[PDB]
Write a protein that binds this ligand. Structure first.
Ligand SMILES: N#Cc1cc(-c2ccc(O)c(F)c2)cc2ccc(O)cc12
Ligand SMILES: N#Cc1cc(-c2ccc(O)c(F)c2)cc2ccc(O)cc12
Lengths: 10, 228, 224, 10
C-alpha cells in the first residue's frame, strides 16, 4: 500500500 | 500542448539531487551495498512525485499508475544514473557522495558484471552526446512504455512524449536522415538499459533474500511487486 | 550496399518455415513442451544460417557472433512468431500445422501468461500495420543490437540495417514527421518483444530443471 | 560446439 499512499498524497 | 512545453513539464518534474549523507570513506561490501539500497529507497520516493508531475499520468487509473511504476522503477533509476555519469568517464555517479569505480564493484559478487554494463551503456550515450532534453523524454518513455478508457489515455500520453523526443532531435538542426538515425540509436540503447535493469533487480532480490542489505519498506514493496 | 539491396538481401535470407505436426491427442504439458522445444531447436539451426546472411555479420569476430546469437535467439524466434501470427488474430502460428490457441496455453504451467503478451504484442503490430520489409529490418536489428574494432564494425552494421528501415518507411510516402513517429513506434515495441522473450527463457529454464521435457544439445547450449 | 559448428563448420 506504500506506493499507493504516495500516489494519492502530496 | 506543444512538444517544447511538454518537455518543459518533464524538466519541471525532475526529482531533486539526492545524497545519502555519507562521509567520504573507502567502500566495503557492507557499506557499498547498504548505501546503494538506501539511495534506491530515497530515489523511489522522489520517482513517484516525478511520475505524478508528468501531464496526465494521475489521470490514468490507479491500477495503471501502479503497474507502470512497479515494472519500470529500476530502469528509471539506472537511466538517471547514466545521465549523471555521462560527463564522468570510468565512473558511476549514483550520488555526489556515492561515486563508484569498476574495481570497487569487485568486492561484491555479481556486481562487477552489472557495473561494466552500466559503464558501457553510459559510454554509448556519451558517444552520441545525449542531450538533457533527450534524457528527459527517454526517461518518461521508459515509464509510459512499460505496459507489459485508461489504456487510450496512456497511448495518447506515450505518443505525446514520443512526439516530444522527435521534436528535440529536430531542433538539433541535423539532416533529416541523421535525425531518423539518431532517434533509432537512442531508442535502441533503451534495450541495454532494460537489460542492466533486469540484472540489477535479480541482484537486489538475491541480496534481499539473504538479508544482507536492510530493505526499506518502499524498496521492498517495489521489489516484491515487480518480481511478482 | 544500398538500403534497398540490404532489404532484398534480408528478404531472400528469410528462413523457410519449419514444419512440425500437432500431436495426435489433445495437448498435455509434456506434448506441448515437446512440440515447442523441438520446433525451437529446428528454427535455431535455420536462424544461424539466416545470421550468416546478414551483410557483415560473418566479418565480426566469432566470439561476437556467438555472443549476439546467445543473447537474442528467443527474441528473434518470438519476433518471427508474432509476424507469422500477424494475420491470425487470437492465434499464435508457431508452425503451419501447429496453430496454438490462447486457451491451449493452459495445459502448461505459467505459459498462458507468456501467450497473452505474445498475442498482445502481435495485436499492437497489427494495429500499426507492420509491413514485411519493416519486419525484416527490425528482426535483424534485434540481432545486431543485442550487444549484450569488432564492436566498431558492429555499430556500423546496425546503422546499415537502421538506414534500410528508414528507407522502407520513407517508401510508404507518409510525411517526414510521420516517418519519424512510425520509426519510433516500431522500435518502442522491441521492449515488449524482449519482455516476452525474457519470460519465455525463464520459463524454458525452469521447465528444464523440472525435467518436464528433455532439453540439451542445441537448445541446452543456447539456454545457458 | 553446436553453435560454433553451425557458425563456422556449416
Ligand atoms: N546492480 C545493481 C544495484 C543498483 C542499485 C541502484 C541504486 C540507485 C540508482 O540510482 C541506480 F540506478 C541503481 C541498487 C542496488 C541495491 C542492491 C543490490 O544488490 C544491487 C543494486
Ligand atoms: N514461452 C515460451 C516458449 C516459447 C517457445 C518458442 C518456440 C518457437 C518459436 O518460433 C517461438 F517464437 C517461441 C519455446 C519454448 C520451449 C520451452 C518452454 O518451456 C517455453 C517456450
Amino acid at each position: 500500500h506504500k506506493l499507493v499512499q504516495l500516489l494519492t498524497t502530496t | 500542448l506543444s512538444p517544447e512545453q511538454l518537455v518543459l513539464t518533464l524538466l519541471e518534474a525532475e526529482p531533486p539531487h539526492v545524497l545519502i549523507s555519507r562521509p567520504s570513506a573507502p567502500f566495503t561490501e557492507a557499506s557499498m551495498m547498504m548505501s546503494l539500497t538506501k539511495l534506491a529507497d530515497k530515489e523511489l520516493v522522489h520517482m513517484i512525485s516525478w511520475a505524478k508531475k508528468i501531464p496526465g499520468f494521475v489521470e490514468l487509473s490507479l491500477f495503471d499508475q501502479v503497474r507502470l511504476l512497479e515494472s519500470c522503477w529500476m530502469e528509471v533509476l539506472m537511466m538517471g544514473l547514466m545521465w549523471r555519469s555521462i560527463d564522468h568517464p570510468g565512473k558511476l555517479i549514483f550520488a555526489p557522495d556515492l561515486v563508484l569505480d569498476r574495481d570497487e564493484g569487485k568486492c561484491v559478487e555479481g556486481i562487477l558484471e552489472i557495473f561494466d554494463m552500466l559503464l558501457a551503456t553510459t559510454s554509448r550515450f556519451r558517444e552520441l552526446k545525449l542531450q538533457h532534453k533527450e534524457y528527459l523524454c527517454v526517461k518518461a518513455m521508459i515509464l509510459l512504455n512499460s505496459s507489459m478508457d485508461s489504456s487510450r489515455k496512456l497511448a495518447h500520453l506515450l505518443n505525446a512524449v514520443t512526439d516530444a523526443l522527435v521534436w528535440v532531435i529536430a531542433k538539433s538542426g541535423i539532416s533529416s536522415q541523421q535525425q531518423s538515425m539518431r532517434l533509432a540509436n537512442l531508442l535502441m540503447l533503451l534495450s541495454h538499459v532494460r537489460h542492466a535493469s533486469n540484472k540489477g533487480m535479480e541482484h537486489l532480490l538475491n541480496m534481499k533474500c539473504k538479508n544482507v542489505v536492510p530493505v526499506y519498506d518502499l524498496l521492498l514493496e517495489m521489489l516484491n511487486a515487480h518480481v511478482l
